[PDB]
PDB file of C-alpha atoms in Angstrom:
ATOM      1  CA  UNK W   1     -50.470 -38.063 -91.101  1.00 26.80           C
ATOM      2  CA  UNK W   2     -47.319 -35.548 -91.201  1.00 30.06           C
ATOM      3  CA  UNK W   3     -48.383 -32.569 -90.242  1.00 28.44           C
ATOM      4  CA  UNK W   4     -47.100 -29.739 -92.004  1.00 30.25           C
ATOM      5  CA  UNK W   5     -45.070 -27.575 -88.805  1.00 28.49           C
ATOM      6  CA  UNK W   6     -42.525 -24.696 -89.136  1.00 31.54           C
ATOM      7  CA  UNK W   7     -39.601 -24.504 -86.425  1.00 33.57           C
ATOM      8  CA  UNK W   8     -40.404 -22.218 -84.251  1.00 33.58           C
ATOM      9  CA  UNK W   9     -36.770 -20.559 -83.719  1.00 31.81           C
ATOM     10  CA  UNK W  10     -37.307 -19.812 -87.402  1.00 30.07           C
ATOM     11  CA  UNK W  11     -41.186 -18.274 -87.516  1.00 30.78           C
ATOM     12  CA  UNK W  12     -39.906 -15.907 -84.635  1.00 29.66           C
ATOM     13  CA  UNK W  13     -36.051 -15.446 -84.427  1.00 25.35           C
ATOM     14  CA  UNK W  14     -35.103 -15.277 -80.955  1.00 24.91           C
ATOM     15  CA  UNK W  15     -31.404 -13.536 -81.597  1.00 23.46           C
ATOM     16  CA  UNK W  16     -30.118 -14.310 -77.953  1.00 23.13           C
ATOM     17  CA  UNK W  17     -26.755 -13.848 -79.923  1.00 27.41           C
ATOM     18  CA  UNK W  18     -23.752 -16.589 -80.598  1.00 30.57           C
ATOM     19  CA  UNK W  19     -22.496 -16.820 -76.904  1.00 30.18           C
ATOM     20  CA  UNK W  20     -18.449 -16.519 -78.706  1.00 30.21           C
ATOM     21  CA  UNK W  21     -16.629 -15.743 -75.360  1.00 32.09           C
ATOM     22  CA  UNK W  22     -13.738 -17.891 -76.301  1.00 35.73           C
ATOM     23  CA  UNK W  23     -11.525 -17.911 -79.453  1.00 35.84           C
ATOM     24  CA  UNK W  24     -11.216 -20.779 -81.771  1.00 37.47           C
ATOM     25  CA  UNK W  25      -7.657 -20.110 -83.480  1.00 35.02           C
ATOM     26  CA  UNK W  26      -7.496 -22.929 -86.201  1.00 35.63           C
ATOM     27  CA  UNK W  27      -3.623 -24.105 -86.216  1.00 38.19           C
ATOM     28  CA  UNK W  28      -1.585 -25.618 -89.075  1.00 36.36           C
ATOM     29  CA  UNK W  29      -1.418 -28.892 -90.340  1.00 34.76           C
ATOM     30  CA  UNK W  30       1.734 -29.594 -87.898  1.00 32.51           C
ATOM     31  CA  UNK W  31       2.076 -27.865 -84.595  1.00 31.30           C
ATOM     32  CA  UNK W  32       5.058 -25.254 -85.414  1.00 32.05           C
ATOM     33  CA  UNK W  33       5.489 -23.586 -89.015  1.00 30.98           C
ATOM     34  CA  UNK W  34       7.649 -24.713 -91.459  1.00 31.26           C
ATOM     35  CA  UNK W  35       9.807 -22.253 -92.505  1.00 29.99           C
ATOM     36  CA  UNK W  36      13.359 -21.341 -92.131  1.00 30.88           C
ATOM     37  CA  UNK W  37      16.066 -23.711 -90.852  1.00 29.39           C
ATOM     38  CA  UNK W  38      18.407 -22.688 -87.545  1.00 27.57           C
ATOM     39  CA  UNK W  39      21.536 -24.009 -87.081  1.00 26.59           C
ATOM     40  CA  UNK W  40      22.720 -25.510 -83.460  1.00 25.61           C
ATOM     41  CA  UNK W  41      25.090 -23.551 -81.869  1.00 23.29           C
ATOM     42  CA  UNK W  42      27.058 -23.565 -78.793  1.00 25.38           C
ATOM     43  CA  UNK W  43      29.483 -21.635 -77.015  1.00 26.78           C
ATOM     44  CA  UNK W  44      33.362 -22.766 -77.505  1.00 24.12           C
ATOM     45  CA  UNK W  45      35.529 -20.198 -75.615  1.00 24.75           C
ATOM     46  CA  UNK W  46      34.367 -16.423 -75.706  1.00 26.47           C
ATOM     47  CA  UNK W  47      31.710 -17.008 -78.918  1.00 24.78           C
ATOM     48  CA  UNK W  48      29.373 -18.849 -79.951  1.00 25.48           C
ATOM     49  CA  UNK W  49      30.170 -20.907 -82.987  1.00 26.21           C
ATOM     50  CA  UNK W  50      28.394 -23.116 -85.498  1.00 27.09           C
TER      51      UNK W  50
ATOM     52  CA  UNK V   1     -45.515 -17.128 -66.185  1.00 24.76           C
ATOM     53  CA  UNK V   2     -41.831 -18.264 -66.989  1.00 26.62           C
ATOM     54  CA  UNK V   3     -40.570 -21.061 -65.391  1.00 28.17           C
ATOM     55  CA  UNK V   4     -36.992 -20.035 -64.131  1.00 29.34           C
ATOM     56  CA  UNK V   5     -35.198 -22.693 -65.453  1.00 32.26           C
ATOM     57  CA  UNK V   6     -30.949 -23.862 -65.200  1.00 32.46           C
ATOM     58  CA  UNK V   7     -30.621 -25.901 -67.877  1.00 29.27           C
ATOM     59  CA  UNK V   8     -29.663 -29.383 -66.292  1.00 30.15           C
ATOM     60  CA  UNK V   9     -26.714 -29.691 -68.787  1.00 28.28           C
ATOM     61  CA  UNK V  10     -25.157 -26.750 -67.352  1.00 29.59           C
ATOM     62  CA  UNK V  11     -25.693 -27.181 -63.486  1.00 29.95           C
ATOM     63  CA  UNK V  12     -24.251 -30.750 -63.897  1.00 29.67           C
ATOM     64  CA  UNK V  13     -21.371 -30.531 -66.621  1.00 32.44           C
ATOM     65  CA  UNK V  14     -21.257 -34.369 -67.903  1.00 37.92           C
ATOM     66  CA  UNK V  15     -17.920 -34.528 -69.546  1.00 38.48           C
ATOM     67  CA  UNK V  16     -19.532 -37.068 -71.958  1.00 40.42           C
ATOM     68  CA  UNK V  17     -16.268 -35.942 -73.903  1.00 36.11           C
ATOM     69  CA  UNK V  18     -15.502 -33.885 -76.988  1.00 36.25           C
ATOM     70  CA  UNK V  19     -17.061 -36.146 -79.339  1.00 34.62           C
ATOM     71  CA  UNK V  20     -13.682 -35.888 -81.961  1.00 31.79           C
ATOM     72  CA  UNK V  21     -12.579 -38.032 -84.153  1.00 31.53           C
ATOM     73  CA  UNK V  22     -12.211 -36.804 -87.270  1.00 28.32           C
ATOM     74  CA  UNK V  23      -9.611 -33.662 -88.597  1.00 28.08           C
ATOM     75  CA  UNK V  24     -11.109 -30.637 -89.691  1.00 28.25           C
ATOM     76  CA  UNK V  25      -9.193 -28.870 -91.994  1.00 29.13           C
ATOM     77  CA  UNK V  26      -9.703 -25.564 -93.482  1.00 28.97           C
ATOM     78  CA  UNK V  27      -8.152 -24.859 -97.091  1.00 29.29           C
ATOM     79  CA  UNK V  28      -7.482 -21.480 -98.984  1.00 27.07           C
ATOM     80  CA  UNK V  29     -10.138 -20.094-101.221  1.00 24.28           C
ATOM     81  CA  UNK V  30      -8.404 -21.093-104.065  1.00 26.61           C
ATOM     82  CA  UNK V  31      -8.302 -25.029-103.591  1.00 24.32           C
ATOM     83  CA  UNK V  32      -4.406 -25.500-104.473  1.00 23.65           C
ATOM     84  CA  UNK V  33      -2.092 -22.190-102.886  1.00 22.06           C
ATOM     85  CA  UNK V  34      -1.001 -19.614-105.527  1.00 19.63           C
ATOM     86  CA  UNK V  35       2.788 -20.203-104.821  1.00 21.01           C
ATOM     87  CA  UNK V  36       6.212 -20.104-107.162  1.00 21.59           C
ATOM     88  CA  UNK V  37       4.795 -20.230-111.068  1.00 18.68           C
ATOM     89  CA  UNK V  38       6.112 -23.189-113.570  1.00 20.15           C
ATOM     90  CA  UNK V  39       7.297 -24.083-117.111  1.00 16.12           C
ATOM     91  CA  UNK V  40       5.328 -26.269-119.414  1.00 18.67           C
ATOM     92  CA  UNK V  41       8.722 -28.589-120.303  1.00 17.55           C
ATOM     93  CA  UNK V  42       8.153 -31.109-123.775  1.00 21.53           C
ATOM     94  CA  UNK V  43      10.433 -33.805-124.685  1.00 21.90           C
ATOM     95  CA  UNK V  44      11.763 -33.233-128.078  1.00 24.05           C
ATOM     96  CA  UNK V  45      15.019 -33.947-127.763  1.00 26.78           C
ATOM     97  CA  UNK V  46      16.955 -36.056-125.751  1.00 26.11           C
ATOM     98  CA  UNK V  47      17.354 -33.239-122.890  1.00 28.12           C
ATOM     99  CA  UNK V  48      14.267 -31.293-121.644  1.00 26.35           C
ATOM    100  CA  UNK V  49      13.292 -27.592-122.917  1.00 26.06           C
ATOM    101  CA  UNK V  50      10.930 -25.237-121.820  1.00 27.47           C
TER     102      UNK V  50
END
């Protein structure tokens, strides 16, 4: 006693669209890249040394 | 005939919550990242050759 049905949305495709108003913007594995090391600087007299 | 409807989920937001738990994760096509190549190394004397 299963009847045997098809979905609907699938007999008659009703392409309202994908309602994507908003980006998704998958991020790395650990909020900031890893990349390139800076070095901590600050300002001694007139320039700004290591 | 067409009811106007408002979709009840939508005219009352229930913030049941996002429903996360679990990471995502997306990986490059090619499982492991093509990066910097190696050398096959053997051990056939004391010191290791390519």
């Amino acid at each position: 006693q299963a009847m045997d049905s098809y979905d609907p949305e699938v007999r008659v495709i009703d392409n309202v669209g994908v309602e994507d108003e908003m980006p998704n913007y998958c991020f790395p594995l650990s909020g900031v890249q890893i990349g390139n090391r800076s070095h901590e600087v600050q300002r001694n007299q007139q320039q700004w040394q290591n």
